[PDB]
Motif scaffolding. Structure first.
Motif, PDB file in Angstrom:
ATOM      1  N   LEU A   1       5.444  -0.691   0.476  1.00 44.32           N
ATOM      2  CA  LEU A   1       5.943  -1.938   1.104  1.00 44.32           C
ATOM      3  C   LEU A   1       5.210  -3.122   0.480  1.00 44.32           C
ATOM      4  O   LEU A   1       5.879  -4.161   0.264  1.00 44.32           O
ATOM      5  CB  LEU A   1       5.755  -1.916   2.618  1.00 44.32           C
ATOM      6  N   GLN A   2       3.915  -2.948   0.204  1.00 43.53           N
ATOM      7  CA  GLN A   2       3.058  -3.987  -0.429  1.00 43.53           C
ATOM      8  C   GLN A   2       3.536  -4.206  -1.867  1.00 43.53           C
ATOM      9  O   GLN A   2       3.662  -5.381  -2.273  1.00 43.53           O
ATOM     10  CB  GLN A   2       1.586  -3.591  -0.342  1.00 43.53           C
ATOM     11  N   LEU A   3       3.856  -3.127  -2.582  1.00 43.65           N
ATOM     12  CA  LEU A   3       4.307  -3.192  -3.999  1.00 43.65           C
ATOM     13  C   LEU A   3       5.630  -3.968  -4.066  1.00 43.65           C
ATOM     14  O   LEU A   3       5.740  -4.851  -4.945  1.00 43.65           O
ATOM     15  CB  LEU A   3       4.408  -1.765  -4.551  1.00 43.65           C
ATOM     16  N   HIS A   4       6.555  -3.727  -3.129  1.00 49.88           N
ATOM     17  CA  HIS A   4       7.882  -4.400  -3.042  1.00 49.88           C
ATOM     18  C   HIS A   4       7.722  -5.913  -2.850  1.00 49.88           C
ATOM     19  O   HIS A   4       8.607  -6.654  -3.314  1.00 49.88           O
ATOM     20  CB  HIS A   4       8.735  -3.847  -1.891  1.00 49.88           C
ATOM     21  N   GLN A   5       6.674  -6.349  -2.146  1.00 52.16           N
ATOM     22  CA  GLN A   5       6.468  -7.776  -1.783  1.00 52.16           C
ATOM     23  C   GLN A   5       5.436  -8.409  -2.728  1.00 52.16           C
ATOM     24  O   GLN A   5       5.035  -9.560  -2.466  1.00 52.16           O
ATOM     25  CB  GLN A   5       6.114  -7.869  -0.298  1.00 52.16           C
ATOM     26  N   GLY A   6       5.051  -7.694  -3.792  1.00 56.42           N
ATOM     27  CA  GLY A   6       4.257  -8.217  -4.920  1.00 56.42           C
ATOM     28  C   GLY A   6       2.785  -8.375  -4.580  1.00 56.42           C
ATOM     29  O   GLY A   6       2.093  -9.133  -5.282  1.00 56.42           O
ATOM     30  N   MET A   7       2.304  -7.667  -3.556  1.00 56.81           N
ATOM     31  CA  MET A   7       0.873  -7.629  -3.163  1.00 56.81           C
ATOM     32  C   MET A   7       0.193  -6.525  -3.975  1.00 56.81           C
ATOM     33  O   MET A   7      -0.149  -5.479  -3.401  1.00 56.81           O
ATOM     34  CB  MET A   7       0.738  -7.357  -1.659  1.00 56.81           C
ATOM     35  N   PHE A   8       0.035  -6.734  -5.283  1.00 56.61           N
ATOM     36  CA  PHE A   8      -0.219  -5.647  -6.262  1.00 56.61           C
ATOM     37  C   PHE A   8      -1.607  -5.048  -6.047  1.00 56.61           C
ATOM     38  O   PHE A   8      -1.744  -3.830  -6.008  1.00 56.61           O
ATOM     39  CB  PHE A   8       0.058  -6.129  -7.690  1.00 56.61           C
ATOM     40  N   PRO A   9      -2.691  -5.839  -5.880  1.00 52.21           N
ATOM     41  CA  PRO A   9      -4.021  -5.249  -5.713  1.00 52.21           C
ATOM     42  C   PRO A   9      -4.159  -4.397  -4.434  1.00 52.21           C
ATOM     43  O   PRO A   9      -4.806  -3.377  -4.490  1.00 52.21           O
ATOM     44  CB  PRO A   9      -4.959  -6.474  -5.709  1.00 52.21           C
TER      45      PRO A   9
ATOM     46  N   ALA B   1      -1.554  -2.973  -2.696  1.00 52.07           N
ATOM     47  CA  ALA B   1      -0.641  -1.838  -2.966  1.00 52.07           C
ATOM     48  C   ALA B   1      -1.389  -0.770  -3.767  1.00 52.07           C
ATOM     49  O   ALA B   1      -1.322   0.418  -3.385  1.00 52.07           O
ATOM     50  CB  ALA B   1       0.599  -2.313  -3.681  1.00 52.07           C
ATOM     51  N   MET B   2      -2.104  -1.159  -4.833  1.00 50.68           N
ATOM     52  CA  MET B   2      -2.823  -0.196  -5.712  1.00 50.68           C
ATOM     53  C   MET B   2      -3.896   0.533  -4.897  1.00 50.68           C
ATOM     54  O   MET B   2      -4.041   1.750  -5.065  1.00 50.68           O
ATOM     55  CB  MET B   2      -3.485  -0.886  -6.913  1.00 50.68           C
TER      56      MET B   2
ATOM     57  N   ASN C   1       1.085  -3.330 -13.800  1.00 46.94           N
ATOM     58  CA  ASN C   1       1.114  -4.688 -13.188  1.00 46.94           C
ATOM     59  C   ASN C   1      -0.307  -5.278 -13.190  1.00 46.94           C
ATOM     60  O   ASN C   1      -0.452  -6.465 -13.546  1.00 46.94           O
ATOM     61  CB  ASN C   1       1.689  -4.657 -11.766  1.00 46.94           C
ATOM     62  N   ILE C   2      -1.309  -4.474 -12.808  1.00 45.93           N
ATOM     63  CA  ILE C   2      -2.748  -4.872 -12.721  1.00 45.93           C
ATOM     64  C   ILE C   2      -3.280  -5.108 -14.143  1.00 45.93           C
ATOM     65  O   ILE C   2      -3.966  -6.134 -14.331  1.00 45.93           O
ATOM     66  CB  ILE C   2      -3.578  -3.822 -11.945  1.00 45.93           C
ATOM     67  N   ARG C   3      -2.977  -4.206 -15.093  1.00 42.86           N
ATOM     68  CA  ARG C   3      -3.322  -4.344 -16.542  1.00 42.86           C
ATOM     69  C   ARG C   3      -2.740  -5.649 -17.102  1.00 42.86           C
ATOM     70  O   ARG C   3      -3.428  -6.286 -17.921  1.00 42.86           O
ATOM     71  CB  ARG C   3      -2.777  -3.188 -17.391  1.00 42.86           C
ATOM     72  N   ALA C   4      -1.510  -5.998 -16.704  1.00 38.13           N
ATOM     73  CA  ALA C   4      -0.780  -7.213 -17.137  1.00 38.13           C
ATOM     74  C   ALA C   4      -1.453  -8.459 -16.543  1.00 38.13           C
ATOM     75  O   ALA C   4      -0.999  -9.569 -16.839  1.00 38.13           O
ATOM     76  CB  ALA C   4       0.670  -7.121 -16.727  1.00 38.13           C
TER      77      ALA C   4
END
Ligand SMILES: C[S@@+](CC[C@H](N)C(=O)[O-])C[C@H]1O[C@@H](n2cnc3c(N)ncnc32)[C@H](O)[C@@H]1O
Ligand SMILES: [Zn+2]
Ligand SMILES: [Zn+2]
Ligand SMILES: [Zn+2]
Length: 425
Positions: free
Chosen positions: A377-385, A387-388, A422-425
């Motif tokens: 759900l976090q990954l879908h809403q762009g909360m990448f750190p 979510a990981m 996403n995190i690497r980017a």
């Protein structure tokens, strides 16, 4: 070479114990069912064979009760459906109890099928019935199941010559009561019921050293603690969000035993589980009967409306560690996921994280999947750190509870690779 063996326990009948030292996440046994069926509420929502949800299922033309995701599943199911098909048709529009449909499939498998790998350690014939502990109320219920089976099966079974040798229907239903496994889908929703007689050797603990997980009808048994040679293997037969009083009632009524474990002796966690105003949580416990009924029938809009009336009540609210409040938050999260309300799903899901950490100690598949859902759900809403962090935690749990042999671990390894890039980017 098996890592487990049948043995005679001192006071809990037969059990399973370790042949070799076991580590967390170790695969101990895997089994297809002897027999299984879809549950009342999931009938015509999930495929009869693979138990996967599909917006449009194809029905068996003969009975119009069995439904499938695909021509492959309908065709592959036919041998194990052929005889029940005649009975489901003949008894239209009556649908039998799940236990009756299950025992029908048991009898057809034992009469017509090759010896089942599911019975390698322990057979249907060997299963515990607890007949000398059944209450008169239970025996009356079993007599009604026997007559229901006789009615349902009449097209295919007229006499004892069509049952296994000295097969007793009363004893068979007694075995089903205390040896049925509820099959969950990947999202940990109940979708089916099966018998797994080898897995039926496992005795219960409220703090177990093993866990089972389902991948469709396929059952994986894993160690979730270190286990020594000769140590008994246990699973928890029960949902973790239960007080010692609730566990006592279910282990008496369904399993005819009194649990001697440390948690039952000390009412471990009961006080925290029942925090908040008792009048409010009694009302929420009562409302959950309907909410869980609606959820079992995949009625997500009605689930969400009943949950919002509690979570966002104008009247007194409960703490999220109250188990009835926690069950309402989880039902609301799943309803929001299925309705595409992903912001609201994440609000409810994040609120469950600390209570789940407390109530699912160590490695529990229910917690692993909950953390994966919140991560997704976090990954879908762009909360990448964030979510990981949650996808990594889900992997830490699920590498133990699910393992490489479970298709959901393959899906999580993909979410992790994505989130990582996403995190690497
Ligand atoms: C799935 S069977 C487990 C295997 C069973 N002991 C046997 O001999 O086939 C469930 C039954 O095992 C017994 N049982 C399971 N866990 C127990 C426990 N912790 N204490 C006592 N009896 C237990 C009860 O008779 C219960 O109904
Ligand atoms: Zn299917
Ligand atoms: Zn059919
Ligand atoms: Zn206990």
């Amino acid at each position: 070479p098996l890592k487990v063996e049948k043995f005679a326990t001192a006071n809990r009948g037969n059990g399973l114990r370790a042949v070799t030292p076991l580590r967390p996440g170790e695969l101990l046994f895997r089994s297809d069912p002897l027999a299984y069926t879809v549950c009342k509420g999931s009938r015509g929502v999930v495929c009869d064979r693979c138990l996967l949800g599909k917006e449009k299922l194809m029905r068996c033309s003969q009975c119009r009760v069995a439904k499938y995701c695909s021509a492959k599943c309908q065709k592959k199911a036919w041998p194990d459906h052929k005889r029940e098909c005649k009975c489901l048709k003949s008894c239209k529009p009556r649908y039998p109890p799940d236990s009756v449909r299950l025992l029908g499939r048991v009898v057809f498998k034992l009469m017509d099928g090759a010896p089942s790998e599911s019975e390698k350690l322990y057979s249907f014939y060997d299963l515990e019935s607890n007949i000398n502990k059944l209450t008169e109320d239970r025996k009356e219920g079993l007599r009604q199941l026997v007559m229901t089976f006789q009615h349902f099966m009449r097209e295919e079974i007229q006499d004892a010559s069509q049952l296994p040798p000295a097969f007793d229907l009363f004893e068979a239903f007694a075995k089903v009561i205390c040896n049925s496994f509820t099959i969950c889908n990947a999202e940990m929703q109940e979708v089916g019921v099966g018998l797994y007689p080898s897995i039926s050797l496992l005795n219960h603990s409220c703090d177990p050293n093993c866990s089972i997980v389902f991948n469709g009808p396929h059952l994986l048994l894993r160690a979730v603690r270190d286990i020594e040679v000769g140590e008994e293997l246990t699973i928890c037969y029960l949902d973790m969000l239960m007080t010692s009083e609730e566990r006592r009632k279910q282990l008496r009524d369904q399993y005819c035993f009194e649990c001697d474990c440390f948690r039952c002796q000390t009412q471990d966690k009961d006080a925290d589980m029942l925090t908040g105003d008792e009048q409010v949580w009694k009302e929420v416990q009562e409302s959950l009967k309907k909410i869980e009924e609606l959820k079992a029938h995949w009625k997500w809009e009605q689930v969400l409306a009943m949950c919002q009336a509690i979570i966002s009540s104008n009247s007194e609210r409960l703490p999220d560690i109250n188990i009835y409040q926690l069950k309402v938050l989880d039902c609301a999260m799943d309803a929001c996921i299925n309705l595409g309300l992903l912001e609201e799903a994440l609000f409810y899901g994040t609120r469950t994280m600390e209570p789940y950490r407390i109530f699912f100690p160590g490695s529990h598949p229910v917690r692993g999947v909950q953390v994966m859902k919140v991560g997704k759900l976090q990954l879908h809403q762009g909360m990448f750190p964030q979510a990981m962090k949650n996808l990594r935690l889900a992997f830490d749990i699920m590498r133990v509870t699910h393992g490489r042999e479970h298709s959901l671990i393959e899906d999580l390894i993909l979410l992790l690779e994505e989130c990582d890039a996403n995190i690497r980017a």
